[PDB]
Amino acid sequence: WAPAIGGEKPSVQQSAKNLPGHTKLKFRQTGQAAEEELRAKDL
RNA sequence: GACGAGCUGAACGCGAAUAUCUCUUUCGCCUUUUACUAAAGAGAUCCGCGAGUUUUGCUCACGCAGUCGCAUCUUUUUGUGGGGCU
């Protein structure tokens, strides 16, 4: 009938799924549809 | 034309030692979840580690000092001299 609304010291409990991982982002390079590469062509 | 041991800082980098975890999958335990198995991958973490001057702490030490702004017989520094012609 009505869901829970999810509004937002800090607690020091550390989850296992919250440990560092995939700590850098991949960006699209030349050759993977990067934005500056794709203005150049007629799609 | 010339001199370090120990600690914390460095900011850059992974000889031989290696454990844990997370995720995405498969496989096996198999009632369920933990807790596990063993494969494929993708990611972290731990415990450590090397060099640059920063000096803190020596308990060592220094300056007419090791170095300064190849030395007479045929092939090299002991030259073959002197004159004069267009």
**How many residues in total does chain A contain?**
43
Spatial contact of A31 and A37, defined as CB atoms under 8 Å apart: yes
- Tell me the C-alpha distance between A30 and A38, whole Å: 9
Distance A20 CA to B18 C1' (A): 20
Sign of CA dihedral A13, A17, A21, A22: negative
Q: What approach was used to elucidate this structure? A: cryo-EM
A13-A7-A23 Cα angle (round to 5): 50
Whether nucleic acid strand B comes within 7 Å of the CB of A17, the answer is yes
